[PDB]
Symmetry: D2
Amino acid sequence: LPNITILATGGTIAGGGDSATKSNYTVGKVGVENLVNAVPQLKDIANVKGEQVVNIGSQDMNDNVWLTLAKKINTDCDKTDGFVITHGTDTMEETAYFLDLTVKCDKPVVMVGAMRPSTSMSADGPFNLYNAVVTAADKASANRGVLVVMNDTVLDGRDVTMTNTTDVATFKSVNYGPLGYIHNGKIDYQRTPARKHTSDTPFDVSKLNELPKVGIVYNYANASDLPAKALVDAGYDGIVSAGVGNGNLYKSVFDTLATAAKTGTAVVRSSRVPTGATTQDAEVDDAKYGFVASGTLNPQKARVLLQLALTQTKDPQQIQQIFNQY
Amino acid sequence: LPNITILATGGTIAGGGDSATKSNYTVGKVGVENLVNAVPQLKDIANVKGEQVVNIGSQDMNDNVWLTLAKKINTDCDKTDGFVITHGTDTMEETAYFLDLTVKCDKPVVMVGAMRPSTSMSADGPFNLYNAVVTAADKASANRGVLVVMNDTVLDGRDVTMTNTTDVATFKSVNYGPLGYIHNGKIDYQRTPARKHTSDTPFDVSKLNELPKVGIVYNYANASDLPAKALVDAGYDGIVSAGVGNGNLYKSVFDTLATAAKTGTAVVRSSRVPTGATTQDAEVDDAKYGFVASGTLNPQKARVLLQLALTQTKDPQQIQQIFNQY
Amino acid sequence: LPNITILATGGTIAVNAVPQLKDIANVKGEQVVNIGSQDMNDNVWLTLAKKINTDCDKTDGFVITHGTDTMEETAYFLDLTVKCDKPVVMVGAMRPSTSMSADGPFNLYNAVVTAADKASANRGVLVVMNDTVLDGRDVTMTNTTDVATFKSVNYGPLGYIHNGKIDYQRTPARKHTSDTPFDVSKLNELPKVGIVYNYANASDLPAKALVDAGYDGIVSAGVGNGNLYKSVFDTLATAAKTGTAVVRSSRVPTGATTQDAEVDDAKYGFVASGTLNPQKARVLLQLALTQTKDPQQIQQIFNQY
Amino acid sequence: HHHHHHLPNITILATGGTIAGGGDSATKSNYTVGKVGVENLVNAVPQLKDIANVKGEQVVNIGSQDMNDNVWLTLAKKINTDCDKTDGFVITHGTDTMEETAYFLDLTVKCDKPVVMVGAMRPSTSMSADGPFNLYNAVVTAADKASANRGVLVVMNDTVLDGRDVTMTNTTDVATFKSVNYGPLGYIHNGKIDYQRTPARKHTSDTPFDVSKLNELPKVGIVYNYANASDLPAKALVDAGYDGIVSAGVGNGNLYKSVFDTLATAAKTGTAVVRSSRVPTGATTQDAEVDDAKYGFVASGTLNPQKARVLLQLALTQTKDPQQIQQIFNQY
Ligand SMILES: N[C@@H](CC(=O)O)C(=O)O
Ligand SMILES: N[C@@H](CC(=O)O)C(=O)O
């Protein structure tokens, strides 16, 4: 049986409400010991040890927790055969991509959450955690980058995102599909992510205590330029635009971000639309303004890569190449 | 043959590249007259008249164009048998919901656009425009609210949204499904929206020359409170949160919007997750904070409703009742 | 609280596992049959429809517990043959009752929520799975194992369930329950209707075997927009002229099998299934055959139900 | 010295389909296939000249509803024989069975240059016909050096799909073709492809299937499952001495009792039996309700019934042993 370390961070998986049949709940009621102990079948497949790293709702996820988790996994890689990280669902897709770029352990790292609190009827958390440990225990999971395991599916940390606010089946890799499906404790992998991850990235957060400041602005009809200007005035290192359609900008947001890019703020165009690439060579001349096109990276993912790009470089053409490789 | 009026606003359906073969283009350059004359088969199904309202990329759509359009459709309704509005795709979902709430005609109002430029190989605009007029001509289209017609499908203006940055099939009613499919110039309607629309709403912009100011703030890990503070400093009437998961807020954002709501700014919780309701009774006590839950309205749709709610009331309890009925 | 009758038929979903049912309904159970729904059959459909029609005034609503594999066929059969306009809700489970995170308990709870909701009446027979209220006509499986398999893949769900409340935003336009002429009250068998599959180099032997057995109707699981392999097309075109009702459906999981594409249905005496997939199209063709053998009237039935 | 951009030679092997189909009117749905020759298809897309030196060869001119084993063998042999004459292949084909041809060629093509299938969901006569840009993007894909070593492809609606997972999702949508279980390989924008995936299952020159000397294939039929299902389709194929039968099962590949009984007999008297699913996505698994090993059945995995037929036919050119056929279903 492999040794598997559970790093716990809180979330609805550890969360609880006063009723099995009412939606109300709060995160962080159940600690890692009782989480693990609630799935005695874990003992059939692995030697499991739990550590509680933080205890937050993933809506409060932040750069300090990201830095703690990357350093812990990198430090502890040699002590275990694989990692499972229990986490809220809300920003699991962000943390998974951060780890995918910063973890230097090529052993399996698997994230897992729950869409129903531990107290609800038909709670999804137990079986999700079981299948997370199945995945982290599988030799075939190594070298695929950081994974999310939800609803019997293995998803790569770059493409994985939420599709639905409440559905237990919400996590999908919406552009390039899942890597494998889990049936009776076994995985048929048919895919692996081409984009560089983990030990083939240059990103090394081992000595960083803070990350570059990157904010996200939304585009819509009659959008205000005032949020964009407030990030510029606060000296943010970068701004990601959640653009309309193929990464387009309301005219005043365009005007503000064009000036910011010219005066040294890194600007990435992404899209509020949930699938497909924000492309070069459409309506916006990125080369002219020094903007970066996000590709399939959604605004929150693009933020992750932009912050790490900014630990390497501030040059727009070098950031674009990062966006083409990771 | 019915009398159908085409009100043009711009978009890629009216926009051009120097090559069939390359993705690059500019929008809103061709007039309604060149657009209609490019599709002579319209004459087989309707007596078409065309009027230019504006000629813009919908990434630049604004409240002034919305008011113009609503007032014109309302004034001209009695003298035509239905309307088609040619529009950019990027914000077509926002304008459709705006007209869905403010058009007092029960006659068909159909929006249409194109995902490919008019000069590209396999341009989608012609057949989209053809099918828009078929829909606007069908007696069964009346009393269904404002419609979008794209990719042989009839979509209700409330639920319609983009799923993909570039796919010709991007427009979907992602929560409740389409109303009908178009085949051979005929529609088989099997659905109608239950939410109150058009003549059944209290919203009347006939005498309004401005709308209440509503902005949208994104949530993500480590979110800045500066966008939210910039809207409050500008005296915004309302703020829509694009929450994580089921409408949840990063702690800093939550603090700022909780503040704003105490001074009487309306705060609507929506979600960046592209399907599913932002619900009551989850992790946020909306009653305590004076917040409204958006239900299945995404952030840009929720802005439309909130702006119009704020013409009627500033009371969050009445705003929540509006978000339950429309 | 309303009185809710659970009619059990078997399935992986196989009260006390869900004590919280008593908070929302006065629940009573009856075993009708006890079978995997892979073995579901016309005898069970007739028992269920009669039982619901007979017992309608004894209860405030019905939940049918059923295997997932053919729940979509039983839901449509009942959608066209029950005359009780109280809520009728089918439910199943994609995971064993004994498994980790078994879905059957909350699926049953949410089915009883739906059958207890006054707003569920007059919507036709429903399937409730994965917090979603789906109409019996368009509901189908999308995935072989996913708890979220059931979707109304062409026209979408009627409403979503949150915290034991439903916000209905849709209702099926096609005629159902008391607005159909299908009456099975006196029938003890249904017209014989088989399905044949089309693929590259498809055999005509299946189609010829249903024809030799004197089947009343044949549904074709066509390729693309209801097309037929030449061997199959010739056997069915011969059958259609000689009395056999023939419906063109599609093996493609979403979209209508249309008129006015490649196949002149009028000339051949064929019926186009619309959005009805092969197994759904079998349900409507059996029931159509209880009323008529005329292909034009069958086509009109396929336009209205 | 400076380099020149030299364009590749691309062969279009035309088989017919809606891409070469036509009706009376741009705004009526009615159409017939078999009208347009490949010469007229290439004349209709002069922009191909910008990206390849194209040659067109007509192999057959049929609707793909009438695709058959003879045409599959013609295509695999033609590609394998002509591999050294060109830099890549595009095959124009009907949509209705494209997913079957693509998977047959995915297992039988030994040429490791790109092989790209394409069709259209609207006839060439429709307003906003999809065929011209689809063909253009198919030749982009066939010309891209990165397309090699990814197996046989299907290019539709700006997407590059693997021939194993690609299937139709909708009867009429121009967007119908999706790799429903494992996703596409790449998207095409402005004539460039960003590939982020490649199929893990063995294909092309990594398979042992070799059709070079074959003039027919093992006979494999498909029976559907549903409530009250007749055993007569299954009995008819056993009685004709079929090599194999694919079941389109309900749910996770389950069998109506009468079909189960016939297939259990067939498997015992030298008919191969593969359990597939009429459900459009997900595996037909081992270890669920059917004891395959007990009955000598094979589980199809994510292969739908028509795709399962293609591999079972090829499997039967090698072995009749259900355990060896199960290994083939686990590796290709
Ligand atoms: N930016 C354009 C895109 C198009 O219409 O396809 C618009 O929204 O006007
Ligand atoms: N074979 C079972 C499958 C299940 O119910 O999950 C049935 O349909 O009865």
